[PDB]
Design an enzyme around this catalytic site. Structure first.
Site, mmCIF file in Angstrom:
data_model
loop_
_atom_site.group_PDB
_atom_site.id
_atom_site.type_symbol
_atom_site.label_atom_id
_atom_site.label_comp_id
_atom_site.label_asym_id
_atom_site.label_seq_id
_atom_site.Cartn_x
_atom_site.Cartn_y
_atom_site.Cartn_z
ATOM 1 N N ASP A 55 -54.131 -71.593 19.781
ATOM 2 C CA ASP A 55 -55.533 -71.209 19.871
ATOM 3 C C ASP A 55 -55.745 -70.253 21.035
ATOM 4 O O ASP A 55 -55.249 -70.492 22.141
ATOM 5 C CB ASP A 55 -56.425 -72.442 20.037
ATOM 6 C CG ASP A 55 -57.893 -72.086 20.156
ATOM 7 O OD1 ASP A 55 -58.409 -71.376 19.268
ATOM 8 O OD2 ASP A 55 -58.532 -72.517 21.139
ATOM 9 N N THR A 56 -56.481 -69.174 20.780
ATOM 10 C CA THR A 56 -56.876 -68.239 21.822
ATOM 11 C C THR A 56 -58.199 -67.602 21.424
ATOM 12 O O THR A 56 -58.587 -67.612 20.252
ATOM 13 C CB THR A 56 -55.808 -67.166 22.068
ATOM 14 O OG1 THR A 56 -56.113 -66.452 23.272
ATOM 15 C CG2 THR A 56 -55.754 -66.187 20.909
ATOM 16 N N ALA A 57 -58.898 -67.057 22.422
ATOM 17 C CA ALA A 57 -60.214 -66.476 22.172
ATOM 18 C C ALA A 57 -60.125 -65.265 21.251
ATOM 19 O O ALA A 57 -60.934 -65.117 20.329
ATOM 20 C CB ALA A 57 -60.880 -66.098 23.494
ATOM 21 N N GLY A 117 -63.020 -67.250 13.107
ATOM 22 C CA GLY A 117 -64.292 -67.409 13.781
ATOM 23 C C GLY A 117 -64.268 -67.013 15.242
ATOM 24 O O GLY A 117 -63.505 -67.571 16.036
ATOM 25 N N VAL A 118 -65.117 -66.053 15.607
ATOM 26 C CA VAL A 118 -65.268 -65.609 16.989
ATOM 27 C C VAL A 118 -66.750 -65.382 17.251
ATOM 28 O O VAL A 118 -67.317 -64.368 16.827
ATOM 29 C CB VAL A 118 -64.457 -64.329 17.272
ATOM 30 C CG1 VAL A 118 -64.786 -63.787 18.654
ATOM 31 C CG2 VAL A 118 -62.964 -64.592 17.150
ATOM 32 N N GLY A 119 -67.394 -66.324 17.935
ATOM 33 C CA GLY A 119 -68.811 -66.220 18.195
ATOM 34 C C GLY A 119 -69.682 -67.385 17.747
ATOM 35 O O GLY A 119 -70.577 -67.806 18.486
ATOM 36 N N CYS A 170 -69.919 -71.070 22.660
ATOM 37 C CA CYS A 170 -69.381 -69.733 22.857
ATOM 38 C C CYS A 170 -70.503 -68.781 23.246
ATOM 39 O O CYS A 170 -71.528 -68.704 22.562
ATOM 40 C CB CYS A 170 -68.682 -69.243 21.589
ATOM 41 S SG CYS A 170 -67.959 -67.595 21.722
HETATM 42 N N1 LIG Z 1 -65.343 -68.734 23.432
HETATM 43 C C1 LIG Z 1 -65.362 -70.067 23.377
HETATM 44 N N2 LIG Z 1 -65.208 -70.678 22.203
HETATM 45 C C2 LIG Z 1 -65.247 -72.016 22.304
HETATM 46 C C3 LIG Z 1 -65.425 -72.794 23.467
HETATM 47 N N3 LIG Z 1 -65.406 -74.141 23.153
HETATM 48 C C4 LIG Z 1 -65.219 -74.162 21.819
HETATM 49 N N4 LIG Z 1 -65.118 -72.910 21.265
HETATM 50 C C5 LIG Z 1 -64.914 -72.567 19.844
HETATM 51 O O1 LIG Z 1 -65.951 -73.147 19.081
HETATM 52 C C6 LIG Z 1 -65.392 -74.058 18.099
HETATM 53 C C7 LIG Z 1 -66.330 -75.218 17.883
HETATM 54 O O2 LIG Z 1 -67.621 -74.781 17.487
HETATM 55 P P1 LIG Z 1 -68.727 -75.826 17.017
HETATM 56 O O3 LIG Z 1 -68.133 -76.519 15.812
HETATM 57 O O4 LIG Z 1 -68.876 -76.756 18.203
HETATM 58 O O5 LIG Z 1 -69.976 -75.005 16.770
HETATM 59 C C8 LIG Z 1 -64.021 -74.404 18.657
HETATM 60 O O6 LIG Z 1 -63.124 -74.876 17.667
HETATM 61 C C9 LIG Z 1 -63.584 -73.096 19.303
HETATM 62 O O7 LIG Z 1 -63.107 -72.187 18.322
HETATM 63 C C10 LIG Z 1 -65.588 -72.107 24.721
HETATM 64 O O8 LIG Z 1 -65.753 -72.607 25.833
HETATM 65 N N5 LIG Z 1 -65.541 -70.733 24.565
#
Ligand SMILES: Nc1nc2c(ncn2[C@@H]2O[C@H](COP(=O)(O)O)[C@@H](O)[C@H]2O)c(=O)[nH]1
Ligand SMILES: Nc1nc2c(ncn2[C@@H]2O[C@H](COP(=O)(O)O)[C@@H](O)[C@H]2O)c(=O)[nH]1
Ligand SMILES: Nc1nc2c(ncn2[C@@H]2O[C@H](COP(=O)(O)O)[C@@H](O)[C@H]2O)c(=O)[nH]1
Ligand SMILES: Nc1nc2c(ncn2[C@@H]2O[C@H](COP(=O)(O)O)[C@@H](O)[C@H]2O)c(=O)[nH]1
Ligand SMILES: Nc1nc2c(ncn2[C@@H]2O[C@H](COP(=O)(O)O)[C@@H](O)[C@H]2O)c(=O)[nH]1
Ligand SMILES: Nc1nc2c(ncn2[C@@H]2O[C@H](COP(=O)(O)O)[C@@H](O)[C@H]2O)c(=O)[nH]1
Ligand SMILES: Nc1nc2c(ncn2[C@@H]2O[C@H](COP(=O)(O)O)[C@@H](O)[C@H]2O)c(=O)[nH]1
Lengths: 469, 469, 469, 83
Positions: A245-247, A295-297, A302
C-alpha cells in the site's frame, strides 16, 4: 457496464450520481445469491477491512474472518506482534466465538472496561480453566469500583458441549435471562461462547479458511526499505495474502517493490495500489500484481483533494480500472468512500471484486480503539488515518522531514445502539448486496456485473426516497 | 492543458469543479521539486501577496521575501512611507528574523500589545543596543498594566553569534525554556532572533533577492493622474517590480497608462490587470505589459457579481489567459479566489506563473491589522477591500462622486492556533504544491503545466474525501 | 445576445446561472452612461414599480417619478381614489420633496407614527400655511404620548426660498443640526422640504415628465367586466400608460380585452401580460399591445410553480420574448424575480426595455404598508401578493368560487438601516446598472444589449466572490 | 515621601488632570483616561497645553498610533485664581 441511452455525462461520476435500473429476475429470495469472490482472496463475502491501526486488530480479524471476510494488518507493525496476532487468529474456532475472560482477583473497573471489548454483552469468569460465573453490566452497577470479581454476584449460565448443533443451542437460550451460551470442551475447560444471533449467523455465513481449515488473515507492507525481506518474513509468519500500500501507486518505487516481491515466488496473491487510471493498472499488473487497489481521494481521512486537488471520483475510476484489469485478466478492489451498502453494491456492479471498508468499521466494539462516551453519554470511538505510513520515506533531519509531513486527521464515529458490533454491519451490507442482486436478477457477483444496467441522476434524484440517516 | 475524454462541459469551470488525475511519476519526495518561477519576478515560490493595506506591510513584506515570495505595496501610499518601507525591507538579514524590541521604560501594556506583532512569541529588551532580557506573555500576566518593563522579571536567553550554522542554533535550543535564540553581532549589538522552526526553514526556502543580494519588494500604481511620474518615482525609490492595478483592465485608460509607463524604459517588469479574456491579455501584452493580472469577481471582498453580474469563473479565465499569453510569449497571475492550497495548485496547473493571495494572509500576525479577540477569546483580525482605490477617478462634488462609490466590504479572519504566523501558511501552501507536483510527476512548474491532466466533477464529487475545514 | 463558445446548456437559465464577460471599453465613468429607455414609457431609468397594493401608493409614486421611474397603480382600485392620487402626483414639485405636515393640536403619538412615513426623518409643523417648527424623534422621546404638538419643543429649521440652486441649499446644511431644509414660496407658505442627499440627487436624476411637465403615473386594469370602459375612464383620469395584467396572458379573454382597449384609440402605450413564450408575445403584439409583460412564476409571492408546476426560468423567457418582440418591433418588460441589481442588469442585457420591481420596494418608508418592529426592535413591513385580482373571474356562490381561490401569500421585508428609503435602493440599482454598462463598454441600454457577451456558470460559480447578503 | 510631597504640592481648588505627551501611544492614552473622573486628558508640550484627548477621539484609531495623530479638540482656558 451498460448505461441508459443518452446517459453520457461530461464529468466523472461518484456513488451518489448513479443508480441501478431493475431488470427481469428469477431469483426467489436473498438466500439464493452466492456472494463468493473470484479474485483468489478466498473471501466468501465481498468485504475487506482496511489496513489501519484504528480498525485492524485481533478481535476484528477473528470476527470478520469467521463471517467470511478478511482483514489486512497495518504496515510497519512489529513482526512479533504480527506473529502473535496470526497465531491467535488461526487458533480460533470456526463456529464458537471467543468471549471476554476474567479472573476472580480482577478489579470491578477492569471487568466493566472489558465488558465492551466484545458484542456478547457478558464476560465469563474463569478459574483454573473452568467457567464459574458470568459478569454483566447489571452486576457491576452499584458495586464499589475497587472490589474484586469474586465479590460480584456471579449469575448462572447455560452450558452446552462443543459440537452441538446451533439449533439446539438456540433452543436452550429461548428463556435464558442472559443471551449467551458457554461451550465447554469434553475435558471441561472453556472453549468459547455462543449467542442466539451467533447461532443464526452460523448457518448463513461460511467462514473464509485456508487449505488447512484455519481462518484467513492478510498483512500489508510499505515500499520503503527492503520490501522483499519484509514480504518474505510476513509470508513465513503465516499471512495468506500480501498488500503493498502506498499513497501514489503509479511510480517507479512501487513497480520496483512489486518486481522484488514477485521475484521471491512466495505463491501468495499480491495486492498493489493505489491508482485511479487504466495505465496505472496496466503498469501494476504487468509488474506482477495480481490485484490492483483502486482509489486516491475518497478516503474519509484523506486530505489530498484539499491539500493538492489531486484525485478522482470513485465510480469512474473503479469502472475504468476494472475494465483495464479484466482486459488483462486481473482484478480490482474498491478502497474508500463507503458509507452505506449502496456504495458497496455500486462498486460491485462497477466491476470490482472486493470492497475495502475503512473508517466505517471503526465505530464498532471489535475495533482496537478504546470506547468513549460523549457529553450526552452516547458511545463513540475515535478513528484516524495512516498519514505518513502511506508516504514515501539526527533530531534536525527528523524535524526537517516532519515539517512538510501531512497531519493526522481525526473524527468521531458514533456507535449505533442496534448495530454496536461489526457483525450487525456485516449483516446490513450483505442484506443490501443480496437485495441488489435480486433486483438485478443475478445469482452471483459475475452475473451482477454482466447484467447490471446503470443510470445517471442529478442532485435532486439522490434526495429522492426516505431521508438518509 | 489536457482534459479527460468526454469532459467538455457547457459552462465555465471554477476551482471546485476540477481535479487533477495522477500520472506516472519518478519524483521520490517533495524536496526534489523546484518551485522557482520563470516569469521574471524573481520569486523562488509561486506566492504573491496582494496589494491591500490590510495585508501588505513592512513585517509581512520582510517575512514573505525571506521565504522566497514577494509583496506588492498598496497603491496611492505616500512616497515617503514607501521609501522607509523599502529601506527597512532591504536592510534586513537573509537568515535572521527581526524581533520585537522594547525599552526598559516602556509600559507593560505596550509590551503585551507588541508581543503579538511577530510569531516569535517573545520580545527582546534592548538597552544601549545590547539585549538585557526577554519578555513573554507569562511574565506580563498578573503584573500591573502600568508598571515598567524593568519591573518585569526578564528571563534568560540563549545567545549565539551571527554567522553560526542553523544546525548549531537548533541544537542549543533543544532544552531552552524559550524557543528563541538571539543573534549578536561581533560588536555585541542586537542583530536579530532565530527559532528552531526558523532554523529548519532556513535550509528549505531560498530567499528572493535582487542583483545586490537584498530582499525584493514591489509597489503598485493606479491609472489616475500622472501614471508615468508615479511609476518613475517608485522605480527610483527601489521597487523591483511595478504593478498597475485597476478593476477593469480592458479599457483605453489602462492601455494609455501601460504605454506611458513602458515609454520610460525603467527596465522593471510590468504587471497589468485585470482581464478575464484572451483579447484583453493580447491588448495588454501588445501595449507593453510583460505580466497580465487575471481575475474579475473571485475576490473575497469583490461585490461586482452581486452589484453588476459581471465576472467569470476563475479556472476558465486563467486557462484562457495563460494560453493567450504563452502564445504571445507572456505570463499571467492568478488573483483572488484562493482559500486552500488546492486553489494554488490548480492555478499553477492551469498555466499561471504566480498566484496572488489576498485576504487569506490577513489572518496572520504579520498583517498590519491590529489583533482582536472575539467573544469566546478567539483571536481574529479584520480585513477589507481596496474599494475606490481600484476604480477610475468642493464638498458638493465630493459627495456627488461618493454617492455612487462602492462601499468598503469587511469580514473577520480567524487566526489558526497552530498557524498563527504567515510562515505556517507558506509551509502549508508549499507542501500542497510539492505534493501536487509529485502526484503529477513533475520536477518543476513548467513540467507541472505540461504533464498535468485535468478532469471535471459534479457537486457531489467535491464533497468526496475528508470534511473541509 | 451572444454566448461564449460551447455554452449551450440543455436547460433553461435563471439570473443565478449567467454572468457578463467584460469587453473592451472606453466609458470613463458611470456618469457618462445614459439610462433612458426607448420603449415609449417615458422613464429615464429602467425601474418600474409593480401594481401591488402593498407597494404602489401616493408617496411611492411621487418619489419614484421624481427620480425618473414610473409606478403602476393596482387594478380594481376605486376610480375616485385613482383621481385623487393622480392629481396629488401631478401637483408635486419636480425638485422639492413633500414633507410630513402636522398641526399644533395633533397628538404626540400621531406625530411619532407619521415621522416614519417619509425618509426625511423630520416633520414640519404648519400653522395657517406657515412653518413654525420641526418635529423629530428626539423631541417626542420622553414626552407624554397624549400631549399636544404645541407642547413639543419645536426645533429651529434652515429656510431657503424656492428656486434656489441645490448647491446653495447643500451649503447651508453643512452645519445644520437637522439635515432638512424647508422651501418657502414667495408668499411665505410651505412649498416642501429638501435634504443634502436630495440636493445631490437633484443633479443626477432627471424626473420623468409628460408633455405638460408633470410627473408621470400609470394605472392597471383587469380583464373581467367591461375592460374598454375602465380603460377609457382611467385614461380620462390622467393616466400616462395603461397596463392590462393577468396571471395567464396567452388566452382568448386577454386578446379580446387588448382588442377592445386598442379600438378606443386612446393614444397611450399598452402593456399586456404575462407570457413566457415567443408565440404569446407574437399574439399579444398583433392584438395591439405595444409592450409585452414577461414572467410567470418568478414572483416572490407567486405559488404557481408549487401549486401547478407551471412556469419558466426568467432569463430564457426574457431573452426569447425580447427577441420575438424586437423581430416584430416591440418591447418587453421583466417582471418578478428581482432581488439584487445583478438581476436588473442581466434583464437589461437580456433585451428587456424595463425591469418591473415588486416586493423588494415593499420594505421601504414610502410603501403604503404600516411600519412594524420585530421582537429585536428591527423595523420591517409586511408584503402580500395580488392573488385573485390577477385571476379570471349569493353567499353560497361566493363561497363556492372562493373554495378553489388561491390564498394570499405573505412575508416579512426587513428595512435596511442605511437604505430605509426607496431612493437609496434606486441609487443602488442605478449604480449597479451603470457599473455593468461601463464593464461592457456601452454608453446606453441599446448598446448594452448589442455589445453584451453572456456566459454560463455552475452552482459553485455563483458562490464565488463576496458572501451574498 | 514622594506621595506626601505630591499631595502637599497640589492646589486647594484646581484638580490635577491626566497629562500626556504627543509621542505617547493611543493605548496608553485610553488606559490613562480612566485614572481620573474628569473624563479627558490634557496633552502637554513643553509645559503648555496643546489639546485634549477624550474617549471619542481614540475610538476607531489604530491602537499604536501617536497622540499627535489624534485630532486634539479645543479646550476652554481660564487663568488661575478665577472665581
Ligand atoms: N491519503 C490517505 N489515505 C488514507 C489515510 N487513511 C486511510 N486512507 C485511505 O482511505 C481508505 C479508507 O477509506 P474509508 O473507507 O475510511 O472512507 C484506506 O484503505 C486508505 O486507502 C490517510 O491518512 N491518508
Ligand atoms: N483479562 C483480559 N484482558 C483482555 C481481554 N481482551 C483484551 N484484554 C487486554 O486488553 C489489551 C488490548 O486488547 P486488544 O486490543 O488486543 O483486543 C490486551 O493486550 C489485554 O491486556 C480479555 O478477554 N481478558
Ligand atoms: N517599540 C516598538 N514599537 C514597534 C515595534 N514594531 C512596531 N512598533 C510600533 O507599531 C507601529 C506599527 O507597526 P507596523 O504596522 O509598522 O509593524 C510602528 O510605527 C511603531 O510605532 C517594535 O518592535 N517595537
Ligand atoms: N473589486 C474589488 N476587488 C478587490 C477589492 N479588494 C481586493 N480585490 C481583488 O481581490 C484580490 C484578492 O482576493 P482574495 O485573494 O482575497 O480572494 C485582490 O488582489 C484584488 O484583485 C475590492 O475592494 N474590490
Ligand atoms: N396629518 C397628516 N396625515 C398624513 C400625512 N401623510 C399621510 N397621512 C394620513 O395617513 C393616511 C395614509 O397615508 P398614505 O398611505 O396615503 O400616504 C392618509 O390618508 C392621512 O390620513 C401627513 O403628512 N400628515
Ligand atoms: N401569481 C401571482 N403573481 C403575483 C402575485 N403578486 C405579485 N405577482 C407577480 O409578481 C411580480 C412581482 O414579483 P417580485 O418583484 O416581487 O419578485 C408582480 O409584478 C406580478 O407579476 C400573486 O399574488 N400571484
Ligand atoms: N503619563 C502619565 N502617566 C501616569 C499618569 N498618572 C499615572 N501614570 C502612570 O501610572 C502609574 C500609576 O499611577 P498611580 O497609581 O500612581 O496614580 C504612575 O507611576 C505612572 O507611571 C498621568 O497623568 N500621566
Amino acid at each position: 457496464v451498460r448505461f441508459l441511452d443518452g446517459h453520457t455525462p461530461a464529468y466523472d461520476l461518484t456513488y451518489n450520481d448513479v443508480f441501478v435500473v431493475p431488470g427481469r429476475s428469477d431469483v426467489a429470495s436473498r438466500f439464493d445469491v452466492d456472494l463468493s469472490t473470484v479474485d483468489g482472496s478466498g473471501t466468501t463475502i465481498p468485504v475487506v477491512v482496511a489496513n489501519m491501526t484504528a480498525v485492524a486488530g485481533r478481535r476484528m480479524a477473528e470476527t470478520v474472518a469467521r463471517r467470511g471476510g478478511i482483514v489486512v494488518l497495518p504496515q510497519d507493525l512489529p513482526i512479533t506482534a504480527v506473529s502473535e496476532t496470526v497465531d491467535f487468529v488461526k487458533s480460533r474456532d470456526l463456529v464458537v466465538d471467543t468471549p471476554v475472560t476474567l479472573s476472580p482477583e480482577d478489579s470491578v473497573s477492569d471487568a466493566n472496561a472489558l465488558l465492551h471489548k466484545r458484542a456478547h454483552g457478558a464476560a465469563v469468569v474463569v478459574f483454573e480453566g473452568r467457567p464459574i460465573g458470568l459478569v454483566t453490566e447489571a452486576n457491576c452497577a452499584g458495586v464499589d469500583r475497587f472490589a474484586r470479581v469474586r465479590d460480584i454476584a456471579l449469575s448462572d449460565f447455560v452450558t452446552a458441549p462443543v459440537g452441538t448443533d446451533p439449533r439446539e443451542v438456540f433452543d436452550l437460550l429461548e428463556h435464558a435471562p442472559i443471551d449467551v451460551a458457554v461451550m465447554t470442551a469434553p475435558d471441561g475447560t472453556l472453549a468459547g461462547v455462543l449467542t442466539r444471533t451467533g447461532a443464526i449467523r452460523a448457518g448463513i455465513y461460511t467462514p473464509a479458511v485456508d487449505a488447512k481449515g484455519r481462518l484467513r488473515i492478510a498483512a500489508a507492507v510499505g515500499i520503503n526499505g527492503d520490501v522483499g525481506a519484509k514480504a518474505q518474513a510476513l509470508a513465513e509468519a503465516g499471512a495468506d495474502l500480501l498488500v503493498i500500500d502506498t499513497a501514489h501507486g503509479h511510480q517507479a518505487k512501487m513497480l520496483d517493490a512489486i518486481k522484488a516481491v514477485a521475484s521471491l515466488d512466495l505463491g501468495l496473491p499480491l495486492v498493489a495500489g493505489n491508482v485511479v487510471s487504466a495505465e496505472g493498472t496496466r503498469d501494476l499488473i504487468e509488474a506482477g500484481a495480481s490485484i490492483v487497489k483502486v482509489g486516491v481521494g475518497p478516503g474519509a481521512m484523506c486530505t489530498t483533494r484539499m491539500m493538492t486537488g489531486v484525485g478522482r471520483p470513485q465510480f469512474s475510476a473503479v469502472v475504468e480500472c476494472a475494465a483495464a484489469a479484466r482486459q488483462l485478466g486481473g482484478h480490482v478492489w474498491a478502497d474508500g468512500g463507503v458509507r452505506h451498502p449502496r456504495d458497496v453494491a455500486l462498486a460491485l456492479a462497477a466491476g470490482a471484486s472486493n470492497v475495502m471498508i475503512g473508517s466505517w468499521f471503526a465505530g464498532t466494539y471489535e475495533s482496537p480503539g478504546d470506547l468513549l462516551f460523549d457529553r450526552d453519554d452516547r458511545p463513540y470511538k475515535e478513528s484516524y488515518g495512516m498519514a505518513s505510513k502511506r508516504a514515501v520515506a539526527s533530531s534536525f533531519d527528523r524535524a526537517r522531514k516532519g515539517l512538510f509531513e501531512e497531519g493526522i486527521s481525526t473524527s468521531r464515529m458514533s456507535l449505533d445502539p442496534a448495530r454496536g458490533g461489526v457483525e450487525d454491519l456485516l449483516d446490513h451490507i450483505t442484506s443490501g448486496v443480496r437485495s441488489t442482486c435480486t433486483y438485478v436478477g443475478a445469482a452471483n457477483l459475475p452475473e451482477l456485473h454482466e447484467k447490471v444496467v446503470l443510470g445517471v441522476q442529478s442532485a435532486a434524484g439522490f434526495a429522492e426516497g426516505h431521508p438518509l440517516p
